[PDB]
Amino acid sequence: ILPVSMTKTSVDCTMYICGDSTECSNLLLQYGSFCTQLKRALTGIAVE
């Protein structure tokens, strides 16, 4: 038995962190855009 593929998985930045929260969505980027790097690594997970 060999697990060959994890489940390709991704996260939306605002939808997860803030979703409907306009204040959170606005204040997220001024505190940085970590979710972008999180996501390139996740996309790399998936594509690799």
Partner: protein
């Protein structure tokens, strides 16, 4: 280049080149905007 003019413009914006090679470029997300809003406070 604008980062939200056209999808190609945003891909250039994200991969940061005007000479972008050939490939699948996930840029961002989208969730359909609320078509409507309903509010019912609890209802002598």
């Amino acid at each position: 280049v604008d980062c939200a003019l056209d999808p190609l413009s945003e891909t250039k914006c994200t991969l940061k080149s005007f000479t972008v090679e050939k490939g699948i470029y996930q840029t961002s997300n989208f969730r359909v905007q609320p078509t409507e809003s309903i509010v019912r406070f609890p209802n002598p």
